[PDB]
Design an enzyme around this catalytic site. Structure first.
Site, short mmCIF file in Angstrom:
data_model
loop_
_atom_site.label_atom_id
_atom_site.label_comp_id
_atom_site.label_asym_id
_atom_site.label_seq_id
_atom_site.Cartn_x
_atom_site.Cartn_y
_atom_site.Cartn_z
N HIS A 41 0.81 -1.23 0.00
CA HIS A 41 0.00 0.00 0.00
C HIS A 41 0.84 1.29 0.00
O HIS A 41 0.27 2.37 -0.05
CB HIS A 41 -1.07 0.04 1.11
CG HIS A 41 -0.57 0.19 2.52
ND1 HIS A 41 -0.07 1.39 3.00
CD2 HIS A 41 -0.63 -0.69 3.55
CE1 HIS A 41 0.22 1.19 4.27
NE2 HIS A 41 -0.09 -0.05 4.66
N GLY A 136 1.92 5.65 10.56
CA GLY A 136 3.34 5.50 10.28
C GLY A 136 3.94 4.19 10.77
O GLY A 136 5.10 3.89 10.47
N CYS A 138 3.00 1.21 9.82
CA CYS A 138 2.90 0.19 8.77
C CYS A 138 4.27 -0.32 8.38
O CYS A 138 5.21 0.46 8.31
CB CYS A 138 2.13 0.70 7.57
SG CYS A 138 0.49 1.35 7.98
#
Ligand code: QQ6
Lengths: 298, 300
Positions: A41, A136, A138
């Site tokens: 993503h 943040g 991820c």
């Protein structure tokens, strides 16, 4: 003595955390050998169509104060693999492993490729993790350490509306019926990891907490009929076998501990605690209990 | 979202753990620059633990009596000195993995991460708090002595604790990195008992603010309280007195959530009176006291 929620030492994983920036999105990457793994993503999303439009120099990879140069990119399920020119000299002995619900692992929470925290958690039976993540985070990873080998089992991708987290194994396959996009997704009804509660009751016994023990035993079928009623996962013969060493150490047969658990579910704790907890803890596996009540090092 | 008991990443500390052996005794050491810090009781024998004269036992030692092992490499001891209850072993190699560090002495209620070690090898990391009675509720077995407590802030490791002993109740006692024990404890096997423990009130309040930031408001009420009335009630539940310093410290969380510290104190009083009634706060059925106001701001 003592029983804490203990995570594996995170050093071998800290030396692998990098920052990955593509466009306006900045998240974490896992740098192993000459590849940086991160959630896809970062690039109604047709990820093949989005990735084909990106060139290597669009992905800014930062390892500390050093910018790594991307020389290739490929997608494997929901993970993006960025080929870099430099092999990570801090790459530990590692494996990518997919875990089952109930299994625990340590999470090295990161922001901007910088590790900020380490916590221990379990893959819930509904495939979510009750983690602690902000924007943040991820690309933060879950792992276990076996001797000198790091088994990477999780990569964080998103937060569900209930506050729980969803992610994939390191091959990009999601844990659970989740997809990596902004859409209506909800965690299924969760259940308690029964084998883990039993392991934690054995840990309480090893630590001198015996008030919940009783003279009774139960059949596996009668226990499971009770477990179904209280949203507890079924206890299998494999679970009973796995609890064998703890049963031998404490002298409490697994079905004898199951009768303790049944009484605890029907009657409650009655103002008492077990290992400083008023709830039945289910995020310690039988292996975690043995490891902590024996001092295995890494 | 979410609220976990989070430890600091332990890598900067793992690269400092060494094994220290003196006779039959093996424990952990902290190797920073060319010095290995460890509990001085590593020099104690069987008929020594009751009333050791550490000065007398240390003077009889030479450098070659201390075997220091960093991984599969034996470090050579070139000097030794004692500073309070810590032994400082000068070694011939500076630790190349030495991080930016400080030795800090913490106050009760402060939290820190513990890297539990056995034979100079890290086995796990957990979070805990210095209890008001100066003990820590750790998870330590035989051989864990010398395991350290720390915080990491802006790439700097602040070492605040070194494990020395387990008290009869299963709680742990230790020193700062200058060898000064936390609490009225001594590195002797004489009868020692932890004082009655109390709940860290400022930490419970911080955790109630964390619950509010995470969307849980069920425990709030329309009441406020004076600081004195709160302290009179809280002391009856074995809660530490809340000082004006604590109220000031909770100021930022009060501003963020819009709940005045004394209004949150009234929710706490009511929770102490009623219990939770089958409900939980941040996945807990008990009031959590091992998150400081600083930890809450850090994590939330
Ligand atoms: O407490 C000590 N060691 C331990 C430390 N942490 C957890 C333990 C768990 C189980 C057994 C031992 C443990 C030692 C040896 C026992 S008597 C003693 C007296 C004074 C001093 Cl400073 C040290 C010691």
């Amino acid at each position: 003595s003592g029983f804490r929620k203990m995570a594996f030492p995170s050093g071998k994983v800290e030396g692998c955390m990098v920052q990955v920036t593509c466009g306006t999105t900045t998240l974490n990457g896992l740098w192993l050998d000459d590849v940086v793994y991160c959630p896809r993503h970062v690039i109604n999303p047709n990820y093949e169509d989005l990735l084909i439009r990106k060139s290597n120099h669009n992905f800014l990879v930062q390892a500390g104060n050093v910018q790594l140069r991307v020389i290739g990119h490929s997608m494997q399920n929901c993970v993006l693999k960025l080929k870099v020119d430099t092999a990570n000299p801090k790459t530990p002995k590692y494996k990518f492993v997919r875990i089952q619900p109930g299994q625990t692992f340590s999470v090295l929470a990161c922001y901007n490729g910088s590790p900020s925290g380490v916590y221990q958690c379990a893959m819930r039976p509904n495939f979510t993790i009750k983690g602690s993540f902000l924007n943040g985070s991820c690309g933060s990873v879950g792992f276990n350490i076996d001797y000198d080998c790091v088994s990477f089992c999780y990569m964080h991708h998103m937060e569900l509306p209930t506050g729980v987290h969803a992610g994939t194994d390191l091959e990009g396959n999601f844990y659970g019926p989740f997809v990596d996009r902004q859409t209506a997704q909800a965690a299924g009804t969760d259940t308690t990891i029964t084998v883990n509660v039993l392991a934690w009751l054995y840990a309480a016994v090893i630590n001198g907490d015996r008030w919940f023990l009783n003279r009774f035993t139960t059949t596996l079928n009668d226990f499971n009929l009770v477990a179904m009623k209280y949203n507890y996962e079924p206890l299998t013969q494999d679970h009973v076998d796995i609890l064998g060493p703890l049963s031998a150490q404490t002298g409490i047969a697994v079905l004898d501990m199951c009768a303790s658990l049944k009484e605890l579910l029907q009657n409650g704790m009655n103002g008492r605690t077990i290992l400083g907890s008023a709830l039945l803890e289910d995020e310690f596996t039988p292996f975690d209990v043995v490891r902590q009540c024996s001092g295995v090092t890494f």
